[PDB]
């Protein structure tokens, strides 16, 4: 297993033992939750990995004090990540349900960490103003950033490197944010007789464009869904590594995205991304500088949308049939019934919306996606046969707690 | 012991009317006095409700 | 206005009573509906003769009794009748009927 995947699988279950400790009927090690969780997780063939068990059992200062682990052992990172992140029978029922899902639904593979995240999210969403689910996700995201930063900076002796405040003070974290331009005019450019059908499909079309963009981005960076903090409308936020490689790759992906978007509409939708450094000390609400850095990245994003097109871009833009009845745009090339190819695909996806629930990203599909892909519609049996499946308060507030507030708002509105 | 039945002519005349108009109002007061003289209950109704002064006031 | 009230309330007329006008009232009332039946305002000569006989009866009744004589003299009935005959307009006759009726209703009130 790639040590990043070991980090992921350990951190996402780093503080699981609490659910056993408060269970009361499953309290094998009533001394500590760490040893108890280690013992419970030591029962399963799929999760029979040893380093994940070490991670889970070794997330606290006293526990790490005598474990005699190697200088390069992932659990220490989990330590800092945990530090960075900051009736009984029901719990027994949760133990039974989790054992069932672990024996029958969970399996260990390179791409199965999303499965662990999805099931844990299904299960712990209201298990404590902080749920355990948010805690595990944020711990995992922070560990991801930390591990990438230390491996990139040629640092391996983390036990001597960390096991502290100066590392807290190092700007090893990066805030990147994305912004979609033309929500309103692209969503409200309908004049045909299929107003409801077109409208409902265009809204989901834009939403899925955003989701596929974020998925492609996270995949390319080898990063996981834990590091995503909020997506919606057009605003979406990621916490990524503050490394030169990361910044370069961000640049390149941004360039390619802009090239495509110029290739598609040229005005109607455009994406702007902006990134700014921060240190781990700022995420702990040390001096409220967290709101400051957020407002700063907001200001940066607001002030990069001014100069959007360089000289050559516009120079081409000026030097190069009629308007679709349904889609108020002329540039796109119309066909039978005066309807364009993409908007006709919109009509098709609208017709397929009501009866089908799964959407599959593939090479041929029906609708055109950013990175030379397409989106089509399938059924759960068809999905299995194929086996990506898609099924002041912000600022001022009162990372984990604003993240969970955003998640609550999103879940309420969704 | 007043009855609306004893008011009929007066009501009728009102419905009829509802410088010659000044003479019509004078005839109204004439018939008003006549009705008050005919029946004592009508006399009390007209006198105590200030019918004559308001009739003069309108005229 | 109440010109009828002025004379009635002032005087009753040396013993005047309502039945002492019956035929006179009767005669007037007769002419009333007669005056109603005509269409044009111009008074026909037969109606003129009716007016004249009404004047004659007025004088005879005034001579018969002193109290009625005092009423008719004090209410100026004879000059009014003469002017009415002179003018020969129906509307003035209807107004005369209204005035005489006001006199009668008042005199019955007291």
């Amino acid at each position: 297993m790639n040590k990043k995947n070991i980090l992921m699988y350990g951190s996402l279950l780093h503080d699981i033992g609490k659910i056993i400790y408060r269970s009361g009927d499953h309290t094998f090690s009533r001394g500590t939750h760490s040893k108890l969780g280690h013992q419970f997780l030591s029962q399963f063939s799929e999760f029979k990995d040893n380093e994940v068990l070490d991670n889970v059992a070794y997330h606290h200062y006293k526990e790490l004090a005598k474990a005699n682990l190697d200088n390069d052992n992932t659990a220490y990172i989990t330590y800092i990540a945990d530090n960075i992140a900051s009736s009984s029978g029901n719990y027994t029922t949760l133990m039974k349900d989790m054992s069932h899902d672990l024996e029958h639904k969970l399996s260990i593979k390179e791409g199965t960490f999303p499965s662990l995240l999805q099931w844990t999210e299904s299960l712990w969403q209201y298990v404590p103003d902080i749920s355990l689910y948010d805690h595990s996700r944020i711990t995992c995201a922070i560990a991801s950033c930390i591990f990438d930063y230390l491996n990139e900076n040629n640092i391996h002796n983390y036990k001597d490197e960390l096991f502290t405040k100066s590392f807290y003070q190092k700007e090893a974290f990066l805030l990147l944010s994305m912004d979609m331009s033309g929500i309103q005019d692209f969503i409200y450019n309908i004049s045909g007789s299929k107003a409801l059908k077109s409208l409902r499909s265009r809204s989901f079309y834009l939403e899925l464009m955003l989701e596929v963009i974020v998925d492609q981005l996270l995949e390319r960076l080898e990063l996981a869904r834990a590091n995503l903090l909020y997506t919606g409308g057009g605003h979406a936020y990621l916490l990524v590594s503050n490394t030169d490689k990361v910044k370069k790759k961000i640049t390149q992906f941004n360039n390619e995205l802009k090239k495509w978007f110029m290739s598609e509409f040229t005005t109607d939708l455009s994406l702007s991304m902006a990134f700014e450094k921060c240190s781990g000390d700022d995420l702990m609400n040390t001096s409220g500088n967290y709101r400051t850095i957020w407002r700063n990245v907001s200001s940066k994003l607001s002030d990069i949308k001014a100069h959007k097109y360089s000289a050559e871009d516009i120079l081409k833009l000026n030097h190069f049939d009629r308007e679709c009845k349904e889609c108020l745009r002329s540039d796109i090339d119309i066909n039978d019934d005066g309807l364009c190819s993409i908007c006709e695909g919109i009509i098709n996806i609208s017709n397929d919306l009501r009866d089908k629930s799964f959407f599959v990203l593939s090479e041929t599909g029906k609708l055109k996606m950013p990175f030379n892909k397409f989106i089509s519609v399938i059924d759960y049996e068809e999905a299995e046969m194929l086996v990506r499946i898609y099924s002041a308060t912000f600022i001022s507030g009162i990372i984990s707690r604003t993240a969970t507030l955003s998640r609550q708002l999103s879940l309420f509105f969704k | 012991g007043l009855t609306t039945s004893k008011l009929r002519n007066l009501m009728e005349q009102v419905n009829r009317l509802y410088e010659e108009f000044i003479d019509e109002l004078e005839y109204l007061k004439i018939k008003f006095y006549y009705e008050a003289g005919r029946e004592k209950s009508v006399d009390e109704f007209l006198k105590k409700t200030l019918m004559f002064p308001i009739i003069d006031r309108v005229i | 206005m109440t010109f009828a009230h002025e004379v009635v309330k002032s005087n009753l007329f040396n013993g005047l009573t309502t039945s002492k006008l019956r035929n006179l009232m009767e005669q007037v009332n007769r002419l009333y509906t007669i005056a109603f039946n005509s269409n044009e305002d111009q008074l026909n000569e037969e109606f003129i003769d009716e007016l004249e006989y009404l004047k004659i009866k007025f004088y005879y009744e005034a001579g018969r009794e002193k109290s009625v004589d005092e009423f008719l003299k004090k209410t100026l009935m004879f000059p009014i009748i003469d002017r009415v005959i002179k003018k020969e307009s129906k509307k003035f006759f209807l107004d005369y009927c209204k005035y005489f009726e006001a006199l009668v209703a008042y005199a019955k009130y007291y």
Partner: protein
Amino acid sequence: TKVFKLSFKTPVHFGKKRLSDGEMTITADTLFSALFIETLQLGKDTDWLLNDLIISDTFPYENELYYLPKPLIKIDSNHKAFKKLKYVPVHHYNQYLNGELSAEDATDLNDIFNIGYFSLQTKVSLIAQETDSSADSEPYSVGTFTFEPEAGLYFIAKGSEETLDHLNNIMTALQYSGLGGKRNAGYGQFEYEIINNQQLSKLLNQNGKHSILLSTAMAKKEEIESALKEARYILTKRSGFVQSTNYSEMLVKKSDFYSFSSGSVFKNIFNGDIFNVGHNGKHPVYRYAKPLWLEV
């Protein structure tokens, strides 16, 4: 350097993308093209008013208050009420430009921003087979604007005196044709008056380091690279058809054009140009990009 004041007294439709859309202020593309079409209708000589006239976009007015489009400047403080604000009155123009405008003052200014109302009028179409036989009617909706009795739009123009006198002649001729969307349908007639407001002229005659573009402009090929050194600008895709070029109106359409808006700020002035967006046409179709600057 005189300015013209326009009163409408009739509903007028401006149009952005569809007949149901309504706009209150139009850009110098529509106005200048109106000037061009009325000049051609007059049969006048066009060179004089083509490469010698300077025209700005149109801006709304009230009983006695005048308005300019917002400057897209970087103010360092809410970031919301300013966004909710679209126009700036002349009285506090420099106050905003020197930041002497407060949040409550902006709120008040937005409050006094009632300068007319928008409407959608329904209609039917019985030129269809309802003329012939059984066929349902084809309703549509149109957008119109109605101004309060003391409102309208005003221009700013500058140039030589002969050009300006010709401009007055063109303005008289145009006052009885239209200036909007569905003009021939009963929308968009107006009467003009020429007024010289001292304060507006004084604002016009300042001197500074920045520049505020009051028209629709687009730099030529060879200077833009020097024009865009430090800027805040907004693009607006200008598309649309043309009048009296080729056979089919549906077949004829101006090539898409991209241009700077009327709130942009620049460091290095550029003189613009009238750019042809014509192709497969019997005459060139000109789009206006020549800047009228406010230097403060």
